[PDB]
Amino acid sequence: TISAQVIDTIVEWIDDNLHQPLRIDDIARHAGYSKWHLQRLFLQYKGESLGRYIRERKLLLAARDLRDTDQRVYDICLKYGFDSQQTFTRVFTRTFNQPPGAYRKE
DNA sequence: TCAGGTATAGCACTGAATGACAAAACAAAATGGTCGCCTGCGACTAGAATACACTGTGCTATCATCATTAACT
């Protein structure tokens, strides 16, 4: 029990939320937690910044949609959180060091 | 009942993340070049001369409109 069961709610919010980005103001409101409700969790249970963890989660979620043989490549990053194509391209290039088409063909 | 404390939240700050503009590359589409077929036109010089189309609805049941026939005037 950390801050009255915030771990059991963060995962549910991440799984049920839409492609809306997750920031301090967005998440803290109806999350049941303060900025400090989440800082201690991100420091202890995860030990990683939010901008990197959210990007990794989006990449792991899109790894299946890229294999689902979808022709609308521009909408894949949009349906999962990336509001722009260039941001998703840079994130994928810095993470996997591979072009988007090279991983989409696989 | 007043107080030390741990749990929870706001605050100060560099530097990484996230926008906007421009250029290079690939696929879809319209335009143009080229090959083989379809087609329009002309010619083939023994003699061949109105006879081959062919008909067949069948004559019901009346009814009304137009020029030739015969004859009164």
By C-alpha to C1' distance, B18 is nearest to A87
Rounded Cα distance, A60 and A63, in Å: 5
Q: Stated in angstroms, how far is A100 CA from B43 C1'?
A: 73
CB-based contact A7:A45 (threshold 8 Å)? yes
Burial annotation A70-95 (CB, 10 A radius, 16+ → b, else e): eeeeeebbeebbbeeeeebeebbeee
Q: Stated in angstroms, how far is A86 CA from B24 C1'?
A: 16
Please tell me what resolution, in angstroms, this structure has.
4.5
Inter-CA distances, A1 with A6, A15, A28, A48, A56, Å: 8, 21, 18, 21, 26
CB-based contact A21:A83 (threshold 8 Å)? yes
Q: How many helices and strands, by DSSP H and E, does chain A display? A: 7, 0
Enumerate long-range contacts of A82-86, CB under 8 Å, 24 or more apart.
Answer: A82/A58, A83/A21
Cα three-residue angle A55-A6-A48, rounded to 5 degrees: 35
Which residues are within 7 Å of strand B by their Cβ atom?
Answer: A 2-4, 21, 33-37, 40, 49, 51-52, 54-55, 83-84, 86-87, 90-91
Strand B nucleotides below 7 A of a protein CB? 7-11, 16-21
